[PDB]
Nucleic acid binder design. Structure first.
Ligand SMILES: [Mg+2]
Ligand SMILES: [Mg+2]
Lengths: 143, 55, 145, 104, 75, 72, 171, 121, 189
RNA sequence: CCGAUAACGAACGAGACUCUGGCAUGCUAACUAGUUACGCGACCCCCGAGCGGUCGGCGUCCCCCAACUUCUUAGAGGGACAAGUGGCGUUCAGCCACCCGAGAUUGAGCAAUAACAGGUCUGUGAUGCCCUUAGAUGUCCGGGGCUGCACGCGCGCUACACUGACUGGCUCAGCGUGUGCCUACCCUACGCCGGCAGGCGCGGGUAACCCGUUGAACCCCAUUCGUGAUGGGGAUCGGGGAUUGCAAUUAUUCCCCAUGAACGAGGAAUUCCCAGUAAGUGCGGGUCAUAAGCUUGCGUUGAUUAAGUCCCUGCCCUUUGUACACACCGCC
């Protein structure tokens, strides 16, 4: 009964993934994680302290879903709704430096490799890590 | 005046940099698909180009 | 946590030259000071190493004076350059965050400087009209009639 | 050879393209070159909406216009070399053709 | 109807008031706790999850915008 | 599509696939006496809703609403 | 490829060329019974066919004028030399061409003939040519300064739907 | 003082190290090449200033270009800035450096409202 | 067998009056697992009559500009309100809703055009479908103004709205408006 | 339309027409679209499955080196006609309900005579007449203005909040564009720098080939806020940082940090709207060197109410009254 990340609910999955990332802390965390907003359209920084680990976990899951996602792709996922105040709203994208630092940290832990063309994907042992954590969170969620 | 000021004003862009390809109008231009034609001239010639009504 | 209100839970504080309510959360209580906002409060509390889930009345004096030290002197506590209000002053060109009625008199001296040099923005400020080029034809009727 | 060419046909109407695509492939079958099937690409509907009035007075009546560009792709592929056999066009006015090879 | 001036932290007067009869009736929501105990409502949520931890409140819904509790079954 | 239209597409597709599978690979007795429950429970489980959209006109904000008019 | 513009732009340019050529031929061949223009295009070259009643008159002495217009269209749009030919062809039943009939009526009016009898003669010739019906409208400063409009119509004439497109010529 | 430096240092403050002291718009403007008319006008004001009588304010110079950023070496000149109708003379203060010439020759006189007319009945 | 929202079997819910039993659709033929079915019930007259009244509430509960497409939130509000009312009362929530609709229907109204005495000239008895329509609309309106500028969230307001209407205590907007309309119709007889 | 009939024979309009949308596992074709099967793999289960699960990872139009078009595309066609039943009907024209059916009323375009002193000579090398024509009402160039503000009105937008806001996670579209005759101005993947606005090298696309599997918004799931003018609201206003341009001031646009004003649902009045409709919600195209609170379309969520009426506002026919005929804004 092998468990893929698709057989577990992705929200507590990425929650436990970020928790494992926190306890096994080897990330190249930039010093400005305490200052920057996660996007241009945001007006508050993320409430979580080690939100960087959570975002890195989410990016790893997205690379599992579909590879070759460069910085612009990931900001398109992490884009959001810019309220623009009195003028009618639109849509904005995520922070390019934030996603780029997340990526450079992800191949900091070499769980991500750049592709032959543009963008980067997950290495097989990173796939192994994701699947192992999916199985363990499946065991926890079940029992 | 001499050439130094007769046409020295730049028009590499902006509305004055475009005229109708039929009547040289500077209003109601349509630049879609490189039409470069006056709106009224478009409505006049739309049969001739081939834009026809189906709805 | 979820215990009784502390004995030293002052309801409002006295910060610099203004008071702030301790009943709300700390992340938003100090924003009542003119020149302080949500983002600035967030960063100074994060760099203050003080819990954000607790009210401003239940803090202790060392914590609040740490906040005072950070607010008055943010450059030396790793605040980046672009986060300050009075950046590159017209008087002395020094990067400073201004925290109190100093901001009020700094705006005052900027406006009187603009009037003294007879700038168009200063002229519109003296006349009370819009300075950013907004249309006055239909709007701004409330302040006059 | 060995030649593998691509021929594409487009116009603004449907009848001319269909009749060219039919008679051309019939001639191809009479000339025993195996034919890759007619590939009908999605139609480009160039849509232009414009106010009916030329002055702006009235009921703000907008007239929209359409131009439908249909195109078809037919590959001619033979073990023998192609262009020396087939050179004739028999092309009516109004329809567009492009002669490309597998190199192109 | 002018204001509510609700308490943000418990005192001695309301802490035991929360403790002794709140897990005795049917419906327990932050709304009813705040409206019948004159507390803020964030304090209501905090107290409710503390009493969840204390094991004499049963949860039924646990939704992000509407959480419902009840007393334990008696009898 | 969206999310709930996605849900309805999936449920219709599964229902239609099962009735086709039971029509082909086994007798149509089972096919009919599952299609009955499908029909007199939910006709839309086997019949797609033909309504898609409706075009906006050049005198209103949507397909049928008109822009607000004034006289004075 | 990069040198060639997209198919959308190319078809737009084709329509533009059709419109410009029609306008130019109308403005020049107005007195010579111009009816319409048809162009046949190939990658090797293009063929231009000008439908006109007076082929003998639109052509100059020994084809001088057709050569003139061929050189004009060669230079104006910048084709390669010898990549365009212009043929003059007589239309069939010029009574049915509303373009040619409108040009004839315009000539008869500019010559000084009365509008009433000229319109009657044009309509009579059109119906003698054989058609389901015809309609002419004259608007302008008839009689005095104040504007008036005449419509002289006979036979069958629809107004609505698709079939009016390919059943009634409009000029 | 403009940025903590005195104007005496500003006279020998060359353009490239000055662009750090100006604002972003002014820095971009000087980063772009200044054209011939601006240079000629600077030559004009420098000529007038050197030939100006000692301890006396210079003679007036007129111009239409009012997009010129005020340079610290032109402080004290008599510039006639076009308003659309006339040329307006105004002092160049030691505070006006980051300011444009059009920012002091107003193009309109402020409106004094009288009794409304037939409109808004 | 149906167990709408996973529980609360419909078969024990019984309509007390024969007046609206042709227009309450909680029966097992109209009982559904989840109140969402874009069945085009407004395409034809009297097709909403066969629509389950829970779905009718769900349609009628999402209003007021900010809520014209937020039907999922409406369904979740319905589910939480059903949970709340069953915890508060202990019986079948659907029974509570049916009783609230029955007690919320205003049995007659008044309408006319000419010179009215107090509100309208003539008194008119109403149809059961209009009874159901007015009941649901009054309930949604009462809950909406019950939850606008108070801490008590919309689920609780809808819950006690249904609770008070299922019995009748002069405490809910729906039955108060019903009594006002009936008194006026009594006056305009 | 049936009928009667001093009318008969017609005609236009409507209808008929074309597109649009809905069913076609019916046909044709699909390496610029896919489906299935297989083989490489990689990872989980390996306790043990192994024809276990995932793959938008790699291949099988690389030419012999798998099949098919269900999904996608676009053509020829079919398919719905009041066709059947029941009821009403002079038993005719027709109408209601129902069965089967994708569909038993899909929205548009076109749209008659006649007319308005309705708008355009500021679209035209459309044009009559009049005015000007060298100190020009021609034309060019420079600047200003068209934004200007005691005030009134219109079209919209934001909003007034817990059916909410912020923070994080999860997750689904379709129109349609994209490098130029003049004409300089394209859509963009990836990699790096920066916090953002931006900058720096490499590519792809003249396009079902690249952006792009258009990872949109709304919505959904957890978090904090707690009924306050509060974390709603971001107008005003200061500083600073980026982009376009010859030039950004009366701020072009964008970013950041400060300030949070009125607004607690709106009088007398009045607007639009009946099913994928209103409304919420984002996205395209136009304008564009820079750009959308506008507009045209597209897409997502998806309702209450009604199957009637002339009460008001009007409209069509017939009769009747007139002193109206510039036609009741009449005339007197
Ligand atoms: Mg018709
Ligand atoms: Mg805030």
């Amino acid at each position: 009964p092998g468990v893929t990340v698709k057989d577990v609910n992705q929200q507590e999955f990425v929650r436990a993934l970020a928790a494992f990332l926190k306890k096994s802390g080897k990330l190249k965390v930039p010093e400005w994680v305490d200052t920057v907003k996660l996007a241009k359209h945001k007006e508050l920084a993320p409430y979580d302290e080690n939100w960087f680990y959570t975002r890195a976990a989410s990016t790893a899951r997205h690379l599992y879903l579909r590879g070759g996602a460069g910085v612009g792709s990931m900001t398109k996922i992490y884009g959001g709704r810019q309220r623009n105040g009195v003028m009618p709203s639109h849509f904005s994208r995520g922070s390019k430096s934030v996603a780029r630092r997340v990526l450079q940290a992800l191949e900091g832990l070499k769980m991500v490799e750049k592709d032959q063309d543009g963008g980067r994907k997950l290495t097989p042992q990173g796939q192994r890590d994701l699947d192992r954590i999916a199985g363990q969170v499946a065991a926890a969620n079940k029992k | 005046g001499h050439q130094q000021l007769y046409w020295s004003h730049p028009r590499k862009f902006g509305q004055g940099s475009r005229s109708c390809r039929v009547c040289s109008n500077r209003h109601g231009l349509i630049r879609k698909y490189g039409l470069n034609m006056c709106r009224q001239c478009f409505r006049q010639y739309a049969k001739d180009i081939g834009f026809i009504k189906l709805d | 946590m979820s215990l009784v209100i502390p004995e030293k839970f002052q309801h409002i504080l006295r910060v610099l030259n203004t008071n702030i309510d301790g009943r709300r959360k700390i992340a938003f209580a100090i924003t009542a000071i003119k020149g302080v906002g949500r983002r600035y409060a967030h960063v100074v509390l994060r760099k203050a190493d003080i819990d954000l889930t607790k009210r401003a009345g239940e803090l202790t004096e060392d914590e609040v004076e740490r906040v005072i030290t950070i607010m008055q002197n943010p450059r030396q506590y790793k605040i980046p350059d672009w986060f300050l209000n009075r950046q590159k002053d017209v008087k002395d060109g020094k990067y400073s965050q201004v925290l109190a009625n100093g901001l009020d008199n700094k705006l005052r001296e900027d406006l009187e400087r603009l009037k003294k040099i007879r700038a168009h923005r200063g002229l519109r400020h003296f006349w009370g009209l819009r300075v950013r080029g907004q249309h006055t034809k239909t709007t701004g009727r409330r302040g006059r009639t | 050879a060995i030649h593998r060419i691509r021929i594409t046909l487009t116009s603004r109407n449907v009848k001319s393209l269909e009749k060219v695509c039919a008679d051309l492939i019939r001639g191809a079958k009479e000339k025993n070159l195996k034919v890759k099937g007619p590939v009908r690409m999605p139609t480009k509907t160039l849509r232009i909406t414009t106010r009916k009035t030329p002055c702006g007075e009235g009921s703000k009546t907008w007239d929209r216009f359409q131009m439908r560009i249909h195109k078809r792709l037919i590959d001619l592929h033979s073990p023998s070399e192609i262009v020396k056999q087939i050179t004739s066009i028999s092309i009516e006015p109004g329809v567009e053709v492009e002669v490309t090879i597998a190199d192109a | 109807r002018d204001k509510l001036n609700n308490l943000v932290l418990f005192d001695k007067a309301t802490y035991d008031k929360l403790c002794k009869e709140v897990p005795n009736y049917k419906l327990i929501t932050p709304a009813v706790v705040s409206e019948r105990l004159k507390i803020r409502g964030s304090l209501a949520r905090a107290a409710l999850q503390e009493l969840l931890s204390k094991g004499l409140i049963k949860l039924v819904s646990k939704h992000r915008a509407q959480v419902i509790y009840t007393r334990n079954t008696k009898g | 599509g969206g999310h709930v239209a996605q849900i309805y597409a999936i449920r219709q597709s599964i229902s239609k696939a099962l009735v086709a599978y039971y029509q082909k690979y086994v007798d149509e007795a089972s096919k009919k006496e599952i299609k009955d429950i499908l029909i007199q429970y939910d006709r839309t489980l086997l019949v797609a809703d033909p309504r898609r959209c409706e075009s906006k006109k050049f005198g209103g904000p949507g397909a049928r609403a008109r822009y607000q008019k004034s006289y004075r | 490829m990069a040198v060639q513009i997209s198919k959308k732009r190319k078809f737009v340019a084709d329509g533009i060329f059709k419109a410009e050529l029609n306008e130019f031929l109308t403005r020049e061949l107005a007195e010579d019974g111009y009816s319409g223009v048809e162009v046949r295009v190939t990658p090797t070259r293009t063929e231009i066919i000008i439908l006109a009643t007076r082929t003998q008159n639109v052509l100059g002495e020994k084809g001088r004028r057709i050569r003139e217009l061929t050189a004009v269209v060669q230079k104006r749009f910048g084709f390669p030399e010898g990549s365009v030919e212009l043929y003059a062809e007589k239309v069939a039943t010029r009574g049915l061409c509303a373009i040619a009939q409108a040009e004839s009526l315009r000539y008869k009016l500019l010559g000084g003939l009365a509008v009433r009898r000229a319109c009657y003669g044009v309509l009579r010739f059109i119906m003698e040519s054989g058609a389901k019906g015809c309609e002419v409208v004259v608007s302008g400063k008839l009689r005095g300064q104040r504007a008036k409009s005449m419509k002289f119509v006979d036979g069958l004439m629809i107004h609505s739907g698709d079939p009016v497109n390919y059943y009634v010529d409009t000029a | 003082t403009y940025r903590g430096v005195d104007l005496d240092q500003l006279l020998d403050m060359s353009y490239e190290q000055l662009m750090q002291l100006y604002s972003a718009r002014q820095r971009r403007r000087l980063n772009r090449g200044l054209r011939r008319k601006q240079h000629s006008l600077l030559k004009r004001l420098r000529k007038a200033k050197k030939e100006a009588p000692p301890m006396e304010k210079p003679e007036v110079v007129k111009t239409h270009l009012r997009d010129m950023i005020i340079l610290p070496e032109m402080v004290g000149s008599m510039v006639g800035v076009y308003n659309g109708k006339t040329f307006n003379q105004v002092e160049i203060k030691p505070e006006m450096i980051g300011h444009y010439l059009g920012e002091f020759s107003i193009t309109y006189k402020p409106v004094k409202h009288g009794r409304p007319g037939i409109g808004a009945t | 067998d149906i167990k709408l929202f996973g529980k609360w079997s419909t078969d024990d819910v019984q309509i007390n009056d024969i007046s609206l039993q042709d227009y309450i659709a909680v029966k097992e033929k109209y009982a559904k697992y989840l109140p969402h079915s874009a069945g085009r019930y407004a395409a034809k007259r009297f097709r909403k009559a066969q629509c389950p009244i829970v779905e009718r509430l769900t349609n009628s509960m999402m209003m007021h500009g900010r809520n014209n497409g937020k039907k999922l939130m409406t369904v979740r509000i319905v589910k939480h309100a059903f949970e709340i009312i069953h915890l508060l009362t202990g019986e079948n929530p659907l029974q509570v809703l049916v009783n609230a609709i029955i007690n919320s229907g205003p049995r007659e109204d008044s309408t006319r055009i000419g010179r009215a005495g107090t509100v309208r000239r003539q008194a008119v008895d109403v149809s059961p479908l209009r009874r159901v329509n007015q009941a649901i609309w009054l309930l949604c309106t009462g809950a909406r103004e019950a939850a606008f500028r108070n801490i008590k969230t919309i689920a609780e307001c809808l819950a006690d709205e249904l609770i008070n209407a299922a019995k009748g205590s002069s405490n809910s907007y729906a039955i108060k408006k019903k009594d006002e309309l009936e008194r006026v119709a009594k006056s305009n007889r």
